[PDB]
């Protein structure tokens, strides 16, 4: 009686510690390459921001009117999204984006700022609703008449919650100096913010910029995290866009940037801009910047793991 083993006519070459191209009976792939060209969000509270920018949800441009108090496990940023309606920019922009991506949503609460002898509702044609409007969560502080002056005010807000409050204010840089005097009066203005962990400073800079949306002025946006039982203080005397409501983080969530559609039919925990990586394999060669619960990215396109003996045919 003779003993032997099985074999096949077409095996699979794998690599070992000693050779490169050992034909075995069976092998399986360990590096994932299959991609699902959509955002698999089955069973997840998803918010597709679309034309609304993530930071806009705190300030409230017209394109973010339906995202002022969203709640999600998964947040999707789109390339067409915009944070602003009036031309401007955020300071510490990406840090705030990363804070908002894992926030689980935002909850707005009025800060209760009362003013006297001042204009509190400045508008512009760039932020269009029924007509010329402004950021829904902000207040453009101007002057009583077409010039006049700007009385120096000091406002304070104490976060009366157990969670830190996201405070966002704005500083207007008009297209020239005469515009700054038309809106806030003559003289050099200042905006100082104080609390127990933050210390600034600020000052405007009027000048002609590029005509974004047809306007040469800009608006700086600044933010801080006010701890519980701590007070934020704004001592200003011109060029100030005060916060109307403060934001609170709801919980936890996942934030991604994508350009493919959402699919509630498939489930996934590993996302990239091109879709979802549904796989049990320990490695992937699809996207090195994939986020979520992903296999580790590797440079190799394929790494075949032997699942059988060496194929020795006649």
């Amino acid at each position: 009686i003779c003993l032997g083993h099985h074999a096949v006519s077409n095996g699979t070459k794998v690599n070992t510690l000693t050779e490169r191209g050992v034909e075995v009976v069976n092998a399986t792939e360990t590096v994932e390459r299959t991609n699902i060209p959509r955002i698999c969000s089955k069973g997840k509270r998803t918010v597709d921001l679309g034309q609304c920018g993530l930071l806009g949800t705190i300030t409230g441009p017209p394109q973010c009117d339906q995202f002022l108090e969203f709640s999600a496990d998964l947040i999707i940023e789109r390339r067409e999204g915009s944070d602003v309606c009036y031309p401007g920019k955020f300071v510490n922009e990406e840090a705030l984006r990363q804070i908002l991506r894992e926030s689980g949503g935002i909850d707005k609460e009025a800060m209760g700022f009362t003013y006297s002898g001042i204009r509190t509702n400045g508008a512009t044609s760039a932020c269009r609703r029924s007509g010329s409007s402004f950021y829904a969560e902000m207040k453009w502080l101007l002057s009583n008449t077409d010039n006049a002056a700007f009385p120096q005010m000091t406002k304070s807000y104490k976060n009366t919650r157990k969670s830190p409050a996201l405070i966002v204010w704005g500083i207007h840089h008009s297209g020239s100096t005469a515009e700054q005097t038309k809106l806030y009066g003559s003289g050099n203005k200042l905006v100082t913010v104080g609390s127990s962990n933050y210390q600034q400073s600020f000052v405007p800079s009027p000048g002609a910029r590029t005509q974004v949306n047809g306007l040469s002025g800009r608006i700086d946006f600044h933010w801080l995290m006010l701890n519980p039982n701590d007070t934020v203080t704004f001592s200003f005397n011109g060029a100030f866009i005060a916060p109307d409501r403060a934001s609170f983080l709801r919980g936890k969530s996942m934030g991604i940037q994508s350009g493919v559609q959402v699919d509630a039919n498939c489930e996934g925990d590993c996302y990239h801009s091109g879709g979802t990586i549904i796989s049990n394999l320990p490695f992937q060669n699809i996207d090195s910047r994939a986020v979520g619960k992903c296999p580790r990215y590797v440079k190799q396109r394929s790494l075949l793991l032997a699942t059988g003996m060496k194929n020795v045919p006649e």
Binding site: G4, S9, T30, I256, Y297, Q300, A306, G308
Partner: protein
């Protein structure tokens, strides 16, 4: 590693579709081929357990650190790309070495299983047969089909055909 597969045995049996290892016998009744179930099931269990050990989901969540639509500042971006590239080199190395090692231990494992089956059959046949060197046990007595089946079922008695085969 163990010398059985690929290997003092010339090659494998493409007709052995019933399992990984098996017996093929020629006698006075005819020729037959059957699969050894315990060795095949053992190798399949070990290699399958290895695959199940490697197939595992990473429950560690990582968040977005870059920005694909509005590029972050150049310095921190270069630090981020530098770190991510280092991690990529580490994981590419780990994956390559892991697959290579696991493949080596897999092939040598199957070779070991074949050698263990052959050695067991040698334990059953004490002086009633003489090994040839190509995976065969030359019998010195008329091993009936029930005798061959007794060899496959690990029930062959050594003292039944002992003296009948010693003088040959």
């Amino acid at each position: 590693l163990f010398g059985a597969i690929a290997g003092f045995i010339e090659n494998g049996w493409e007709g052995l579709i019933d399992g990984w290892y098996g017996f093929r016998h020629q006698n006075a009744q005819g020729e037959g081929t059957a699969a050894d179930y315990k060795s095949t099931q053992s190798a399949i269990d070990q290699i399958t357990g290895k695959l199940n050990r490697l197939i595992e989901k990473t429950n560690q969540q990582f968040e977005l650190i870059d920005n694909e639509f509005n590029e972050v500042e150049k310095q921190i971006g270069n630090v981020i790309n530098w770190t991510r590239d280092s991690i990529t080199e580490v994981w590419s190395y780990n994956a390559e070495l892991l697959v290579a090692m696991e493949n080596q231990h897999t092939i040598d494992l199957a070779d070991s299983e074949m050698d263990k089956l052959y050695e067991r059959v040698k334990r059953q046949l004490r002086e009633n047969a003489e090994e040839d060197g190509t995976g065969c046990f030359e019998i010195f007595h008329k091993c009936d089909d029930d005798c061959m089946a007794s060899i496959r079922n690990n029930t062959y008695d050594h003292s039944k055909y002992r003296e009948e085969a010693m003088q040959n």
